[PDB]
Design a protein around this ligand. Sequence first.
Ligand code: SPH
Ligand code: SPH
Ligand code: MYR
Ligand code: MYR
Lengths: 238, 238, 238, 300, 300, 235, 235
Amino acid sequence: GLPVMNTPGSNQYLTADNFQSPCALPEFDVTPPIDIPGEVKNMMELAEIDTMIPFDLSATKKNTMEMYRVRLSDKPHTDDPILCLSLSPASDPRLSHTMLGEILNYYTHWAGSLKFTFLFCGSMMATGKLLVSYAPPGADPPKKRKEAMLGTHVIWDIGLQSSCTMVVPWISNTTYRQTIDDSFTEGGYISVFYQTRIVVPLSTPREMDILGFVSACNDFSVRLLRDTTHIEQKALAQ
Amino acid sequence: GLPVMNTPGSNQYLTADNFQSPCALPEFDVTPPIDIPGEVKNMMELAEIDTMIPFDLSATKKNTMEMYRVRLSDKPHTDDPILCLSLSPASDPRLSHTMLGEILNYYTHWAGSLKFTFLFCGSMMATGKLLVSYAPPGADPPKKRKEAMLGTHVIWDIGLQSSCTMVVPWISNTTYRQTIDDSFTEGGYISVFYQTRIVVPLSTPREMDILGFVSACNDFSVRLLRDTTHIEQKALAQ
Amino acid sequence: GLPVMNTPGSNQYLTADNFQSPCALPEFDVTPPIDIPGEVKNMMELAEIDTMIPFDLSATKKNTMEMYRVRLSDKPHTDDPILCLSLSPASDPRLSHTMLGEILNYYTHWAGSLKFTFLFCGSMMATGKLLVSYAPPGADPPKKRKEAMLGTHVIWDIGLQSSCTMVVPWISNTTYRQTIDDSFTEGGYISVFYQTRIVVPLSTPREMDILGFVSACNDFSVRLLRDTTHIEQKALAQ
Amino acid sequence: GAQVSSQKVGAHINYTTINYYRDSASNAASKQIKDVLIKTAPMLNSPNIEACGYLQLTLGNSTITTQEAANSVVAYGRWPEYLRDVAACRFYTLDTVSWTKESRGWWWKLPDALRDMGLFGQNMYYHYLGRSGYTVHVQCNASKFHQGALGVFAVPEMCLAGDSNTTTMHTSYQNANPGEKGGTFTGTFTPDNNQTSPARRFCPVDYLLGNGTLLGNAFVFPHQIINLRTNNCATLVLPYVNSLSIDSMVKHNNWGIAILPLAPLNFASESSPEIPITLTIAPMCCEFNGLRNITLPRLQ
Amino acid sequence: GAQVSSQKVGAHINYTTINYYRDSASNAASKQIKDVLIKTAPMLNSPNIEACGYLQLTLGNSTITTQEAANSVVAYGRWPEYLRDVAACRFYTLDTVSWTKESRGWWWKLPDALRDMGLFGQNMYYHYLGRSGYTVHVQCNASKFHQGALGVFAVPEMCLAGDSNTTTMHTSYQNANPGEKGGTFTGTFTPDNNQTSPARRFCPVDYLLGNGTLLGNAFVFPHQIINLRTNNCATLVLPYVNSLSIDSMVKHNNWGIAILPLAPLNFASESSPEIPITLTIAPMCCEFNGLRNITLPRLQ
Amino acid sequence: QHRSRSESSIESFFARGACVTIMTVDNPASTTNKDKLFAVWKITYKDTVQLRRKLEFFTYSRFDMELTFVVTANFTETNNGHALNQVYQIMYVPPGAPVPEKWDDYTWQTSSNPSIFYTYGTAPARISVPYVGISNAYSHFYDGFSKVPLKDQSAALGDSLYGAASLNDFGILAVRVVNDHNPTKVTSKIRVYLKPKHIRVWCPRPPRAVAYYGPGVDYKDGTLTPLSTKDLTTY
Amino acid sequence: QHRSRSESSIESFFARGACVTIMTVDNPASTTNKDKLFAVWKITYKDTVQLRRKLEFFTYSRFDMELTFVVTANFTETNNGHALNQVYQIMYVPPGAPVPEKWDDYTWQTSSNPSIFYTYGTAPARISVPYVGISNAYSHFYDGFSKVPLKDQSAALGDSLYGAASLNDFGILAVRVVNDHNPTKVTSKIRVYLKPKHIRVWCPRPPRAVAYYGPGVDYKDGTLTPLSTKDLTTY
Ligand SMILES: CCCCCCCCCCCCC/C=C/[C@@H](O)[C@H](N)CO
Ligand SMILES: CCCCCCCCCCCCC/C=C/[C@@H](O)[C@H](N)CO
Ligand SMILES: *C(=O)CCCCCCCCCCCCC
Ligand SMILES: *C(=O)CCCCCCCCCCCCC
C-alpha cells in the first residue's frame, strides 16, 4: 500500500475540470473523419464575419425586416445625425444580437478593434457625401456634425463608391472592457452625418436605404467564458 | 488500481497548506504586468522606513496631532529626563502603532537593531546640546542624566545639526524577543536629556518642538506569522 | 485521475508510525544550534554511567540516605554473607531504581555484561580482604563463602585499594532476558563475603561503610520500547 | 511515456502528463498582425472565384457569358470535387420569378429544385446514392433609375420551421419539397389551426430566416449580394457539404437557396414596380451510385 | 519533468515537485551587511534628485532657480517616463495659501489642481485618455527667528473620507475635485447630519491623514520635510503611478498632495504670525490620447 | 504582451459539463399498491437549452464525450423512519437491446451492456464515450426525411417526420435503485452533465434567436419578437 | 548562523487561507409557505476585516487566487426526523450572466459558467482562479469616479459613487442545496476561505488605524481615538 494523504478538493466535481475517465465502450472502432468544407477552429473566427445591424429598433419596425434599413433622402443639407449608436458591442440593443454581439455574450471581457461597413442601396443616379464618425468616451455624445467632425472620421462618397468601411481602433483605458453596460468601461460614440447632401435627378427615387454591418478585426479577443442571457428555459427547473 | 494507503492528515484542511488545485477558469489569458513604480518584496522593507513616534500620549493630547511633538525650552539646566521610553517595539504604546510596530504585530518574534532619529524643529538662532541614551535591561530605569550617561549614548549638538540619529544595537540574551510585554525578553530603556541647555537670543521663541522617528535596521527580522490585535470586527461572528 | 486502490491500514493512526505531514508554520526561520556541552546520543550511554545502589532497603532505613550504606566491622571471621543480591537489573528492588534499572524499564528485553563497583569508605588504618561473587543460575543461591567461592569471583584487598570492580559477564541461555522477574530468564546471584576480616588498630573506628555501584558495559543493549511502571498519573483519566 | 510540456502562462515552467487508459476517448482535453483589416479565417468569410485562384462560364453545351465575377463566391473557400480516393450535369434554367415592391423573399432546395431537369433528374431517381456540387447563378437586372438589394444566401442543411403550434417536425415530404417551383417567405407567422385536417407545411418568417435565427446574421452563411446600383447578377459556387461522403438525393436535401430583399425594390416614381429574377443552376463534379429500378415518388 | 530542489532548512537535503495542471494558477506557491544603517530597499525610502544619478530647474519657458536640492525626492526611486514601447506641460504656479499658528493642513489632487492651467487643461479635456508625471515644488520661506515644520506628502490613490455617518462613499464629484483652490484638513470629525439635503463632501481629520490611518506613518509615502530652520522649499519628482498604462484624467486622480504642519508655526513672540506657502507644479513626460469634442464638466 | 485567443478556441468554448437531463427514480415500501420507479431516458442534447444553443452555432460536429452523474436523494413522507445507503445502477441500453420493463427484471443482468454501479455519497460518477456516430460526423441539422413516400405504396407507410433520421440514434439510459423496497420511502434524482472533449466543428450558423419549440427548428406564436425598442438617433 | 527574512516575504505574509465570507442556504419541507433558501454572494475581500487590513498595506496588487470551501450543516427544529446526505452546488456567475432567482431555475444548468458540486462530509472543496483583472493590477484604492458629470446632461445621470469603478467587478457566487425539499428541515453554511498565491504588490500604505466603515475609506464618529494614554516621562 503506497502511503497517501488526501488534500482539499478531493471527491469534488468541478464542471470546468479536465481529467481522464474510464471508457464505457472499450475497443470501439471509430468512424474516420472526412474533409467536410467549412471547419471552424475558433469562435473569434465567427466574430470576424460581417453581420447586418438592426439600426432602426423603433417601436413599429423592430422585429421586422425593416429594422435593418436606415432611410436617407435628397433633402436639404443638415448637420443633424442620420444615426447615433454606442460602442457597447455586447450590450447595446442594436449591436448585441449581431453575430459578434452574440459571441461576446458567452464571454465577460472583450478587447480589440471593431470594423463598421456601410452599404448604399439607393440608385446609380443618386449622388452624395456622408460623414462617418467615432468619438472616444468622456464628453457629450455628438449631436451635430460640427462636433462629430472633431473625432475619428471618414468621408464617404456615395456616388463614387457604393460601400464604405470604417475601422474603430481599440482605444481604452482598461486592458479589456466588460460585455455589459458599464460607465467604467464605456467605449464611445459612433454617429453618421450628411457631409453635403443626397442629390438625385428627375425621374428617380428621392428616398433610399443604407444597410450597415459590423464585425471584429483580427486584433480582437475575448475572455472569461460565461452563460448568456440571450436564451432561456424559464419553465426549465434544474 | 495502484494500491494505496491513507495516512493521518487525510481530508483535512490546514489553512497554511501549500498544494495545487484545479483551475476554475481554464485557458484564461491573463492581462500582462506593467512596470508599476514602488514594488514591495518583503514586509521588512517597510519596517525599515522611518515613521514618526507618538511620544506624548498624555491624556489631553493623545489622538491628536500633538502626540507627535516633544516640547523643549530655554530653561535652566537640569538632569531630569526630557522623555523616557521602553524598548518594546511592538507592545509599548508609543512604539506599537508606528509602521515598524504595526508590522511587528503580525508576527510573534523579533530580532535586530533599531534606529532612532530626532529632528529639531526649533529656530535657527536656537542652540543646545542634548544627550540621547540607551540602557540595556536589568537595572533601575534611568531617571537622571548621571545614570543614563553610563550606558550607550550619543551627544547631540542642536545648533550644529538639526537632526540626530542613534542606533540601538541588538543586544539580547535570547536569540529573539517576543512581540508582547514580557520581562523574560525585555529590551531596556531609551531616554533623552539636556547635556547643556537650550539657549536662545532675544526676539526669539523660548519654546520649541522636537520630532522623533523610529525604524528597523537591515540586520532585522521577524518570525511566526500571527493575527494582530490592532484591528477587529467585534460585531463580526465567524 | 490516476487509478488507485485502498489497502487495509488506510485512515488508521498508528502512534509508532513514521510519515511526512504538512507544516503549520511555513518558511519559519529556525534558531541555529549552539555547541552545548553534554550531548547524549543513545539511552545506553546513560545506562553505562555508574550509579549508586540502594542495598539496604530495610524497613527502617529505606527511603533515607542510609539505604545506600552497607555496614562492615572489625568482627571475627565468618563465612556468612555481607550482602545477597539477585541479577534482575530491572526488577530487583535494589537495582530497579538505579539509572541502569530505570532505563531498563522503558524496554522489554536486555542483554549484555554488567559492571559492579564497590567503594570502601572506612579509614586508612583499616585493613581487610573481601570476596565478591557471581553465581550463574540453576542452583541454591549461595548462603556461605564456601559455595560462593565456587563461582565467578574476585578477591578484594581493602587495605591496598579503596575500590574494587567486578564484571558480571553476559551468560544466558536465551539471547535476551526480560525486564521483569521471570524464572525462565533468571540471571543468578551476586553476593559479598569476608575473605579474612576487617582489622583495625586502637584509637580507630571499628565499623565502617561500603558504597556500591552498578552500570552497563559497552556490550550491552536493550529492545522493545515500552511504558514504565516507575511513574504514574492514577487520577489521570485518558 | 510521461509527457512534459509548457504550462498555460501569463506574459512576464511546465506540467507533466501520463495517459492511464487504452482508449483515446478516455484522455483529458488537450488545449491546442500589421493590418487589422485582414481576415483570420477568410474561407469562413465567402471568397471569390478570383480569391482562391480559379468571361464565358461553360458546362457541357450550356454557357453563361459573364463580366460580373468579383460578384462570385466559392462557399467555404472550397471548390467542388469528385468523391475521391457527365453532361446530365449542366446548366438548367428554372422558372423565372417576379420581384415586386412587396415580395418578402424566395427559397429553393438542392437537389430538389432540379429533380425534373433532363438526364440529371433521371440519374437521381435511378440511383440509391448520388452526390453533387453546384454553381448557382442568380440573374436580376434593372435600370440606373431603379434601386434595391437582394441578399442571396446558400444555407447548408436548411431546415425550415413548420405551420403548426400543436405538433412539431411535421411538414410533409410533398410540402417540404416544392421542386423547381420554389417556395416563398412570409412577413408573419400564421399557425395552421385546422386540427383535424392539417396543412402540414412550412411557415417561413423572413426576419427569422424561416428557422428561428435572425436574418441579419444570415451572412455567416456562404452568400452574395445583388445591389441593383452596382451589379445585376450573382454567382455562388457550392461544394458538396454533408456529414457523409455520399447520400440519398431523394430523402435528403443538402443545400438551401434563400433570396431575400435586404433593401426593397424601388423605381423612379411608380407606386408599384416589378423586375424579374431568373435562377440558372448547374450540378458539379457530380456522381451517382447504386443503380436499380426507378424511384417514383409520391410528390402529388 | 519532476523538479528537485533544496528544502527550507535551519543552519547546522531536498524535496521533489511535479506540476499536475496546465494552468500556472493551479500551481502551488513557490517560496522564492557590514553597515546596518543602510536601507534594504532605498527606493521605498524617498531618494534625492541626487541619490539615483539625475541650480536652474527648467521646463519649456518656465524655470525654477534652486540651491536647495538635497531637499528633493524622486518618488519610489522612479523618474517620470513616456508611455513606451510638449510645452503645455510646464510649470504652473497655483494660488498662494497662508500658514498660520492655527492651520491644520492643506490638500490637492493631480491632475485636478491643474485642470485650468493653460494648454495643459485644454489638452486634458479634449482627450479621452491622458498620462503625466509631475514635479511638485513647495515654496515657503521665513526668518532665522521663525520656527516650524511642514510635512509634504505625495500620496498615490489618495482616497479621502467623507462627511457622512448615515451613508458611505458618497462625496460628490464636485466636492471631491476642488481644482487649484485646494481643499483643507481638520482637527475633528463633524458628521454631516443634514439628512434631507446632504453636503456630500469630505471631512479629512489631520491626525488620521483624512483616510483612517495615522499621520505619523504617512512617511511610508513619497515625501519631504520643510524645516524652517534648515530649508525653505521642497521638491518632489512624481512618476505616473497607476494600475493602468494610461487612464481618464477627468474621472480619476492619480496623486494626492498633502501638506501638514508637523511642527506648528512660531515667531519671535507674536501671538499670531503668518507665512505664505506657494505651490509651483509642472506636468512631466506627458501624453494624451483619443481626441474628440471637448469635455465640459459639471464642476459648478 | 500580446492577447491570446485560447479561451475562445472550440475546445475551450465547450470545455464545461452541462446539465443535459434530470432523471427521477425511487425506492418505495414493498407493501405499496404502486410500482417501484425506475428511470428510462432517451439520450439527447435537446432536453435542456444551453448546451443545445452552443452546439447549434455549428451544422456538423465530431467529439469524444464525457458524462458525469450527480446523484441526490431525499425523504418523501413525514415518517421519521430511515434507510440504509443506496446503490444505483446506470445501464446504457443501445438501440436494439432489451429495454427494462421493471426495476426487477433480467435486462439488468447487463452481460453485454455497459453499466455503472454508483454508491450514494461518493464522488459523482463519470465515464467517457468515443465518437459513436454511424456517419462521419454528428449532424446538428438534417434537412430531410427518414424515408421517401412512394406513389405506389400507401400514403401512411411512406410517411415520416421532417428533420429526423433514425427513430433511435443513441439508445437510452436506464436507471434504478438496486436496493430492495424499504419500509420508509426515498426518492432520488440523477443529474446528467455532458461535456464534449476532443471536438471538431464544421459549417457555422447564427445562434437561436427565439425560444426553442421542440427537437426541431420550429417556433411558437407569441415568442417571435426578441428585439427591444430603441430609437435610431439615440445613443 | 544568519537570520532569514523568508517568513516576511510578501508570499509568506499572505500564505494563509482567510475567511472572506459566510453563506447561508437551506433545504426546507416541500409543504412550507416560505421559499427554499439559496445564497447569492457578491465576491469581495471587504466583508471581513483581517485579510482586508493586510491587503491594504498596499495600493495595487497582482495575484492568482485560491478559494477553499468549508461546509457545515445542522438541524433547525426539534422534529427528531432525518435527512440524507446533501449535495451542494457552488456556481460562479460572472458579470453579465443570468443570476438565479430560484433554487430551481434554468440558470443552474450551468453550461458555460463554472460550478462546483460538493458532497457533504467530504474534504473541503477547492479551486484556483488566475489573475482575472481587466487592468494590469488589482486596485485596492481608486481616487476617482465611475463617470464624469456633464454640465449639459442632467445632474442625476452624471452621478456616481466615490472610489468605485465597475458596479460589478468580479460577479457573484450563487449557492444551493441540490437535493429536493425534505420533510424535516436542514440549514447549512458555507465558509469561503481566500488565499492569494503567486502575489505581487506595489505602492505601500500605512495600516488601517481606526475601525472600517463600509467598502471605502470612511470612518465613523466615536471610533476615531485608537491610541492609549501614556505619559511622556514614563517607561
Ligand atoms: C454507462 C453510460 C454509457 C453512456 C453511453 C452513451 C452513448 C451514446 C452517445 C450519443 C452522443 C450523442 C451526441 C449528440 C448526437 C447528435 O448530435 C445528433 N442527432 C447527430 O447525428
Ligand atoms: C467555482 C468558483 C469560481 C470562483 C471564481 C472567482 C472569480 C472572481 C475573482 C475576483 C478576485 C477579486 C480579488 C480582489 C479584487 C479587487 O482587489 C479590486 N476591487 C481591484 O480592482
Ligand atoms: C512512461 O510513461 C514511462 C514513465 C512512467 C512513470 C512511471 C509512473 C507512472 C504510474 C502510472 C502507470 C499505471 C497507470 C495505468
Ligand atoms: C517529468 O515530469 C517526467 C517524470 C515524471 C515522473 C512520472 C510520475 C508522475 C505521475 C503524475 C503524472 C500525471 C499527473 C497529470
